[PDB]
Amino acid sequence: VSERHSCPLGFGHYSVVDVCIFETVVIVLLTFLIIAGNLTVIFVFHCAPLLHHYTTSYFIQTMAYADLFVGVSCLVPTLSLLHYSTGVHESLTCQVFGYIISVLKSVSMWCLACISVDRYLAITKPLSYNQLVTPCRLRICIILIWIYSCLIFLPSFFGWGKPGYHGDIFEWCATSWLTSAYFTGFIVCLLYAPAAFVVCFTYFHIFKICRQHTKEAKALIVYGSTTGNTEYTAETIARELADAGYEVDSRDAASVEAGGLFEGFDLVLLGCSTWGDDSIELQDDFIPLFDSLEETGAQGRKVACFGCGDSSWEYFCGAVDAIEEKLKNLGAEIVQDGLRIDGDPRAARDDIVGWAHDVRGAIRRYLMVLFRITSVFYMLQLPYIIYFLLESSRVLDNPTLSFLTTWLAISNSFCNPVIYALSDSTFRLGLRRLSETMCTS
């Protein structure tokens, strides 16, 4: 009774009464990050209006909740171990804890596989996508991900063996519960191999697709200019995109009608200077376009904004703030922070050309964020999967590796939110405007 085993990170011992304190603390500090990051993504998506890619946001929000639940699920037994151990074998507790974490990691994994297929359909069949990827079908997909995730780890309760190392924070799970080559083989067949195959196969086809060989894409530039500064900025941006192979249609706001103005454009750049003696006022030719902006076809449009102003005014390039706020509220995708020119734009020509270089990545930006999140997710999990396969097969047994690969796999519940939050301009625009109101209180 009360035999001792050395801790995985090399210092101390654990038993039915002794706890590895250093190992418990580094788990607790990671759960704090997972909880904070996922609550921030959930808050900003809902409270700040985050309306572009409504459909794909079903999977991103399901992942943020599954990741919040990983953080809390891990914080509860680790805090409880820091306070005391029961002095007995926690057979059911570690079995139940290990099941929950496995189910939640499966949910995130199947959400990324569905995001890759969602993007494959939006790219190859944008009109079919609009009319056939509906909220009802998105809810059925998420219900099936939860049920299927619960079903594949169900055998861990019926004598098939240990489904992972997550519960090895409990002495009985680490020493007395064994993995099985047959159960690991089952998990790899029903979860790891199929989910990884869907993402790899799907992103392989996404990265091969070319719909336009005559042009990169077609961009509309609409500008409001009273003394010619925003016109010059517009003309400099138009020539940078034309040289890069875009079909560029640049039009003075004075000469345009709002009705269906953005229809047929992959990218729309709205240029407007700020005027008004006393208030913030949009350049005169732009006011009628702003007033009728709900008629332009802005919902799901990729838009970026530019304008000239002067920072002695309290609303520096306020026309740009006002146009971005309305486009966000109309469910446009702000693909890039606005270009806000102080003074003569001829003296800021490098800032203009650099901005125009960045917008060249705007049409593929959202897809590339979802690709980076998918690839970081699988890379952080790969050491765990390799350890699982080799230890289930009895090629090696290394508690230090078991510990480090499991910590790193839990850490993808913090990387998903941090990458998404920092890579979306609409989100960082939702994050800052919500946080400016939460900075006062």
Ligand SMILES: Cc1nn(-c2cccc3cc(Cc4cccc(C(F)(F)F)c4)sc23)c(CO)c1C(=O)NCCO
């Ligand atoms: C603390 C501790 N670690 N351990 C381990 C020893 C050897 C290997 C591993 C692998 C682990 C997998 C893991 C790694 C990181 C985050 C997670 C998480 F899912 F929980 F979050 C899980 S824990 C652990 C013990 C022994 O049981 C103890 C302890 O104190 N025991 C005595 C009271 O039961």
Ligand SMILES: Cc1cc2nc3c(=O)[nH]c(=O)nc-3n(C[C@H](O)[C@H](O)[C@H](O)COP(=O)(O)O)c2cc1C
């Ligand atoms: C009457 C007046 C009001 C202005 N108000 C603002 C303002 O509120 N905010 C700002 O950033 N700049 C303001 N400006 C500076 C202009 O926006 C800046 O000169 C800009 O280059 C004009 O560009 P445009 O030639 O494209 O219209 C104002 C200028 C004038 C003459």
Ligand SMILES: CCCCCCCC/C=C\CCCCCCCC(=O)OC[C@H](O)CO
């Ligand atoms: C590559 C992606 C990985 C994901 C990103 C995660 C960021 C990691 C940050 C903090 C985790 C905790 C770090 C552990 C080191 C601090 C050790 C410590 O402070 O423990 C002292 C304790 O008192 C001894 O008893």
Ligand SMILES: CCCCCCCC/C=C\CCCCCCCC(=O)OC[C@H](O)CO
């Ligand atoms: C038992 C434990 C053994 C496991 C220990 C080994 C570490 C494995 C983890 C990551 C390797 C990958 C590290 C480098 C990440 C870059 C790969 C990548 O992301 O490639 C796609 C790229 O975007 C264009 O093709």
Ligand SMILES: CCCCCCCC/C=C\CCCCCCCC(=O)OC[C@H](O)CO
């Ligand atoms: C987790 C698998 C390793 C991923 C690839 C290394 C990435 C290199 C970057 C940082 C080093 C972070 C610490 C590396 C973990 C130490 C590995 C370890 O402790 O295993 C060997 C040990 O000396 C006998 O058990």
